[PDB]
Write a protein that binds this ligand. Structure first.
Ligand SMILES: *[C@H](C)[C@H]1/C(=C/c2[nH]c(/C=C3N=C(/C=C4\NC(=O)C(CC)=C4C)C(C)=C\3CCC(=O)O)c(CCC(=O)O)c2C)NC(=O)[C@@H]1C
Length: 291
């Protein structure tokens, strides 16, 4: 155990900013070796401006999450990074700057438009239909659904927008087991979950033992964390190899999910995930007034 999905890098720093852990794909994306970085200082590995951004963000020890940091190394180029504090470690997760031609970009206009359209929705039903259609425009996903939770944590697909070629899931009910209590808990903490490719080979993080708590590294807060085989099989059975879900939060309660599926592996960068997050906040607020 102790692995992530390969579409990014995970570096784990101790509270003092010393590199204590890393995903095995660091030489393949940066050039530097994993062992040639464990025990190394962040001041040596990152450029002066990057180390400054990191130090400034980590100067408040209460702050659990950080806005995207441009991460540049001394041997560089720039990665888009997210940090989280969990299990007494600072997790720095990097998305490579290498954009694919199939992947969407330029989310601003489409997001402003989505929010303009969403505000004009008259009912809870028509706001969820507009949110599904608008998220599909922003992202390019094949199918986008609004999956609402019932009191027993079972859900129903109350809304959906999709490519004509893909099948419908509108009106379908599923047990609470499909999205279990511990998956649901992490969605109240980190609002967007991504699985760009259900057939990924997990990339391990070495060492997989936390050098402070004694206990192995808890990656339950990492964006790149591995997926339970049960969910991967569930997705494979419906023919969707790329997924993304955005929680609809009513306070800390999970009202539902904005579920996105793609037939082939599909990736939405940090910019588009933050754009979708905003749409979900607008939608949750409107659900609150309309309820
Ligand atoms: C395993 C035996 C049981 C199980 C576990 C499981 N599910 C998830 C995560 C998700 N499950 C879904 C559920 C749906 N997706 C949909 O498209 C539909 C309607 C067609 C449903 C009911 C969702 C949206 C997620 C979130 C992840 C994602 O965006 O795809 C987990 C957590 C996996 C993770 O790492 O996030 C687990 C452990 N699923 C089953 O079916 C079994 C009963």
């Amino acid at each position: 155990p102790g692995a992530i999905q390969p579409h990014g890098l995970l570096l784990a720093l101790a509270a003092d900013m010393t590199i204590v852990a890393g995903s095995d794909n660091l030489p393949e994306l940066t050039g530097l070796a994993i062992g040639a970085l464990i025990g190394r200082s962040a001041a040596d590995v990152f450029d002066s401006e990057t180390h400054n951004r990191l130090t400034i963000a980590l100067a408040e020890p209460g702050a659990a999450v950080g806005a995207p940091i441009t991460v540049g190394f001394t041997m560089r180029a720039g990665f888009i990074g997210s940090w989280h504090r969990h299990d007494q470690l600072i997790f720095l997760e990097l998305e490579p700057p290498q954009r694919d031609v199939a992947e969407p970009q330029a989310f601003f206009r489409r997001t402003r438009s989505a929010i303009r359209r969403l505000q004009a929705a008259e009912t809870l039903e028509s706001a969820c239909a507009a949110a599904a259609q608008e998220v599909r425009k922003i992202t390019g996903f094949d199918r986008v659904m609004i999956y609402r939770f019932a009191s027993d944590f079972s859900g129903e697909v109350i809304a959906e927008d999709r490519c004509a070629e893909v099948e419908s899931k509108l009106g379908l009910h599923y047990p609470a087991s499909t999205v279990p209590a511990q998956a649901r808990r992490l969605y109240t903490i980190n609002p967007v979950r991504i699985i760009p490719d259900i057939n990924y080979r997990p990339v391990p993080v070495t060492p997989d033992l936390n050098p402070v708590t004694g206990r192995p590294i808890d990656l339950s807060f990492a964006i790149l964390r591995s997926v339970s085989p049960c969910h991967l099989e569930f997705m494979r059975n419906i023919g969707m190899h790329g997924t993304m879900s955005i929680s609809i939060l009513r306070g800390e309660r999970l009202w539902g999910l904005i579920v996105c599926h793609h037939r082939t592996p599909y990736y939405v960068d940090l910019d588009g995930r933050q754009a979708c997050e905003l749409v979900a906040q607008v939608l949750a607020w409107q659900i609150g007034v309309m309820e």
